[PDB]
Paper text:
NadR belongs to the MarR (Multiple Antibiotic Resistance Regulator) family, a group of ligand-responsive transcriptional regulators ubiquitous in bacteria and archaea. NadR binds the nadA promoter and represses gene transcription. In the presence of 4-hydroxyphenylacetate (4-HPA), a catabolite present in human saliva both under physiological conditions and during bacterial infection, the binding of NadR to the nadA promoter is attenuated and nadA expression is induced. Each NadR monomer consists of six α-helices and two short β-strands, with helices α1, α5, and α6 forming the dimer interface.
First, we crystallized NadR (a selenomethionine-labelled derivative) in the presence of a 200-fold molar excess of 4-HPA. The NadR/4-HPA structure revealed the ligand-binding site nestled between the dimerization and DNA-binding domains. Unexpectedly, only one monomer of the holo-NadR homodimer contained 4-HPA in the binding pocket, whereas the corresponding pocket of the other monomer was unoccupied by ligand, despite the large excess of 4-HPA used in the crystallization conditions. Inspection of the protein-ligand interaction network revealed no bonds from NadR backbone groups to the ligand, but several key side chain mediated hydrogen (H)-bonds and ionic interactions, most notably between the carboxylate group of 4-HPA and Ser9 of chain A (SerA9), and chain B residues TrpB39, ArgB43 and TyrB115. At the other ‘end’ of the ligand, the 4-hydroxyl group was proximal to AspB36, with which it may establish an H-bond (see bond distances in Table 3). In addition to the H-bonds involving the carboxylate and hydroxyl groups of 4-HPA, binding of the phenyl moiety appeared to be stabilized by several van der Waals’ contacts, particularly those involving the hydrophobic side chain atoms of LeuB21, MetB22, PheB25, LeuB29 and ValB111. Specifically, upon analysis with the CASTp software, the pocket in chain B containing the 4-HPA exhibited a total volume of approximately 370 Å3, while the pocket in chain A was occupied by these three side chains that adopted ‘inward’ positions and thereby divided the space into a few much smaller pockets, each with volume < 50 Å3, evidently rendering chain A unfavorable for ligand binding. Taken together, these observations suggest that Arg43 is a major determinant of ligand binding, and that its ‘inward’ position inhibits the binding of 4-HPA to the empty pocket of holo-NadR. Specifically, in addition to the different inter-helical translational distances, the α4 helices in the holo-NadR homodimer were also reoriented, resulting in movement of α4 out of the major groove, by up to 8Å, and presumably preventing efficient DNA binding in the presence of 4-HPA. Subsequently, upon ligand binding, holo-NadR adopts a structure less suited for DNA-binding and this conformation is selected and stabilized by a network of protein-ligand interactions and concomitant rearrangements at the NadR holo dimer interface.
Numbering used by the authors:
A (entry chain A): 1 to 141
B (entry chain B): 9 to 85, 91 to 145
């Protein structure tokens, strides 16, 4: 065995943590016919109201051409609508439709159950702390 | 959303470490595997798959290339995996630059916050098992 690095990999910790959430969320998403990437988008559009294409890619962490393809499909499905701003000719905003909002709620409630279970166990204070630290690490640069 | 927060925090780390891994001509997945092997000493294929969060056929491909590069050895003739001498060496020289970038990050957020995050992730993982 070599000498361990000074810092443990926060990266691997982040990856294992999200993957443990996904095994709990995978059957929920499968039944609603929604992928992991699709739900990141759906939950972000619901919670932010709207995001422009560029901000949506950064926050959902999806490569840009792949996001376009996903968006195209979500629009054809009637879940996502494009919003154009009167002060920028190229910039595109995205928002859930009525159908998209309803889908968010019915999936959102199922998903939130595990978040609630963890929160009743870990405590609201710690839960907030974890969310705030992730956001502080994420907003670096 | 802890889910979304987790992936955003990860994407932010990636940007900090990308230049280090690319200069070494190593991918995130390859580095992930090298670290897990280095830090566990020896692992079976399945355990490696689970800890790296990589599906088995995709892992086989990555392992195939790490072996051809002389960094990883399969134990032959359930399959076990181990780093070579060179793989260990690579872990140390890349690992040092990686620790350096972590020191810089820790200076931005603060050591206490970094430790808090590590502690909460560890507590999160132990809640997940308990609930199940
Ligand atoms: O945790 C590490 O080992 C550093 C690292 C972080 C993110 C990434 O994508 C690659 C390496």
């Amino acid at each position: 065995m070599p000498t361990q690095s000074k810092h443990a990999s926060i990266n691997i910790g982040l990856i294992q943590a999200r993957e443990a959430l996904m095994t709990q969320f995978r059957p929920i998403l499968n039944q609603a016919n929604i992928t992991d990437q699709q739900w990141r988008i759906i939950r972000l559009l619901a919670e932010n109201g709207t995001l422009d294409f560029q901000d949506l890619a950064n926050q959902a962490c999806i490569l840009r051409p792949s996001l376009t393809g996903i968006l195209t499909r979500l629009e054809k499905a009637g879940l996502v609508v494009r919003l154009k701003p009167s002060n920028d000719q190229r910039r595109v905003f995205l928002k859930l439709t009525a159908e998209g909002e309803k889908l968010y709620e019915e999936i959102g409630e199922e998903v939130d159950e595990r978040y609630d279970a963890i929160e009743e166990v870990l405590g609201r204070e710690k839960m907030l702390l974890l969310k705030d630290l992730l956001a502080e690490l994420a907003k670096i640069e």
